[PDB]
Design a protein around this ligand. Structure first.
Ligand SMILES: Nc1ncnc2c1ncn2[C@@H]1O[C@H](CSCC[C@H](N)C(=O)O)[C@@H](O)[C@H]1O
Ligand SMILES: Nc1ncnc2c1ncn2[C@@H]1O[C@H](CSCC[C@H](N)C(=O)O)[C@@H](O)[C@H]1O
Ligand SMILES: COc1cc(O)cc2c1C(=O)c1c(O)cccc1C2=O
Ligand SMILES: COc1cc(O)cc2c1C(=O)c1c(O)cccc1C2=O
Ligand code: NA
Ligand code: NA
Ligand code: NA
Ligand code: NA
Lengths: 318, 319
């Protein structure tokens, strides 16, 4: 078993070959595929692609019957190139992620606050993405897709209608607030991120800002989704301090994050270390940082997403 | 979820790599419990960040956690020894050259030029490329030396090497298999053929710089071909075995020894052979077919059980 654990990478690489080529897009709506006919149609090598299909059956990605193959129920997402899972495998084993992982070991002996990613590429993750269209488009697309998947549940567990002026900080392409604004109308909607060129969307104010320097005041609802996992404890407190300075007594901050729970994998925690010198935090750790910034936890809920549990934390100023 | 953690399979390999390649794992010898605060003080590794990696290694079953200390699992004792095959395996498994080969795998399936994904990434076939890369050649040859050393006792146990006079190991690399056999089976002539820019030296071994695609030398009564055919197409595999038939007389024997594909075990190795070589992991049946096409007869077959994989042992003579 230990040699196949060492060879874990091979599972990721096999899925990449199947999905990144678009071969998986021939397996829509649970159809059984004749690999002989797929080979003639697409010009993929029959015998060598048949061998990859056998390894995908072993992995449980494909199901074998009547001398054909279908995607498993869970793996229907691989037939859709717009699926978050399609964008995830495109990034997971890309050359930039690989080269960052190869600096991980060395990064554990350095104290200069440089991520494994920065050691490999010469700039921190988001600064590097500014000059790399492959990384930025695919990463921003992944975040747009997971945002889209949480909007319904989020609207369900919190009354957005009470609020007037809403700012999503580090909101990226602004998918979260665009989808919220279609359901909760007649509000003011703003999205802050790092924009070389401002996005444009009906009734969205896009702001080019820096949440390490300042959060703009005069909003009664702030959102910070999947940002703190990219930052040290020190940088996290600084971001939360900037919220406290921007917020008055009536303001609310919705802190929304993939949350660390003992039953689930630590693999994401380690990726945040490699890419950002960040971490996946528990409810307790998030509460500690918030208290250090002079904020108080007024509500906590868990949102069950398919891939991971999510922490919903409503914060107000002390 | 299960699907997102399968997509993230690479993270397991990378975590093991960071733990072993740094030599951190060499602090966990003899199943001792390590205090990560002490290890940090001694080695200068970040306590908090290394403690998180240890928790992932516990999840994987590489480490065992008791009273805020960590030991290697019984199975993973090998990670504390930098001479172990497993140490060399993880240093190659996610190295930049293997990674870049894997990123060409999908594209390689639409080409019919007989270029491996490795050659598409690097501009030369695997072994030709290793001639100009000491990192890959030294670590690959070291891995092969370690797995050769692990099979020698079982091999001597299942075959009578003492009946033979002149022994050639073809593609024998650093010559570890014949060096270890020669310490237990004395008074013989021992030769090792491979691609040598400079000939290795070892008491009573004749190292030959050769090419088994062009010719194999006649005048030996025992020939060995271990873990070579998995690096070659069916066509090139047949050519290698024909070259043996042309080298052999009716009294010659060839021992064809290979990791063998059985349905109970993972297809992951078969796919690696495609990526690196346009090779494949073959069944007993497939090996016997290639041998028949080359004009060789199966005298004997056995299975050798190694910890990680089954091995095919096939004795061949000419028709
Ligand atoms: N200093 C900074 N100021 C503002 N935004 C920043 C920033 N550093 C990083 N970001 C942004 O932080 C985001 C992290 S990814 C999270 C995106 C979005 N909140 C979602 O959950 O889907 C990226 O969009 C990145 O561009
Ligand atoms: N054309 C060629 N002629 C001879 N040896 C070759 C060759 N092409 C590759 N090789 C050798 O084939 C070997 C494959 S790895 C097997 C090594 C050894 N027999 C063992 O089992 O441990 C390598 O040592 C490589 O250098
Ligand atoms: C670098 O990857 C991420 C960074 C984030 O800030 C947030 C997420 C990710 C992910 O990779 C990710 C993922 O692969 C699957 C589901 C969710 C996420 C993130 O939220
Ligand atoms: C390129 O990898 C190999 C080529 C071979 O001819 C034989 C082996 C290998 C391996 O990679 C390998 C491994 O990773 C772990 C255990 C055994 C082997 C090979 O025998
Ligand atoms: Na296609
Ligand atoms: Na990612
Ligand atoms: Na050469
Ligand atoms: Na040898």
């Amino acid at each position: 078993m230990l040699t196949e654990l060492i060879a874990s990478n091979r599972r990721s690489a096999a899925i990449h070959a199947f999905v990144d080529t678009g071969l998986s897009t021939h397996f829509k709506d649970g159809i059984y595929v004749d690999i002989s006919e797929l080979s003639r149609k697409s010009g993929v090598n029959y015998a060598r692609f048949s061998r990859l299909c056998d390894f995908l059956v072993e992995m449980g990605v494909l199901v074998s019957n009547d001398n054909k193959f279908r995607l498993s129920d869970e793996c229907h997402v691989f037939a859709n190139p717009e699926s978050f899972e399609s964008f995830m495998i495109k990034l997971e084993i890309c050359s930039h992620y690989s080269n960052a992982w190869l600096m991980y070991g060395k990064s554990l002996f350095e104290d200069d606050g440089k991520s494994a990613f920065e050691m490999a590429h010469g700039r921190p993750f988001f600064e590097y993405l500014d000059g790399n269209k492959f990384l930025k488009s695919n990463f921003d697309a992944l975040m747009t897709r997971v945002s889209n998947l949480i909007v319904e549940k989020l609207l369900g567990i919190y009354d957005f209608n009470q609020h007037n002026r809403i700012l999503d900080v580090g909101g990226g392409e602004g998918e979260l607030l665009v989808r919220i604004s279609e359901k909760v109308k007649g509000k003011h909607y703003a999205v802050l991120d790092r924009y070389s060129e401002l996005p444009v969307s009906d009734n969205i104010d896009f702001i080019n800002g820096n949440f390490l320097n300042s959060i703009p005041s005069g909003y009664d609802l702030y959102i910070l989704k999947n940002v703190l996992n990219n930052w040290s404890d020190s940088d996290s407190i600084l971001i939360l301090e900037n919220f406290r300075k921007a917020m008055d007594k009536n303001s609310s901050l919705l802190l929304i994050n993939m949350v660390k729970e003992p039953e689930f994998s630590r693999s994401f925690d380690i990726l945040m270390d490699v890419l950002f010198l960040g971490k996946e935090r528990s409810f307790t750790e998030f509460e500690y940082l918030a208290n250090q910034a002079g904020l108080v936890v007024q509500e906590t809920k868990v949102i069950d997403q398919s891939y991971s549990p999510y922490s919903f934390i409503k914060l107000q100023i002390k």
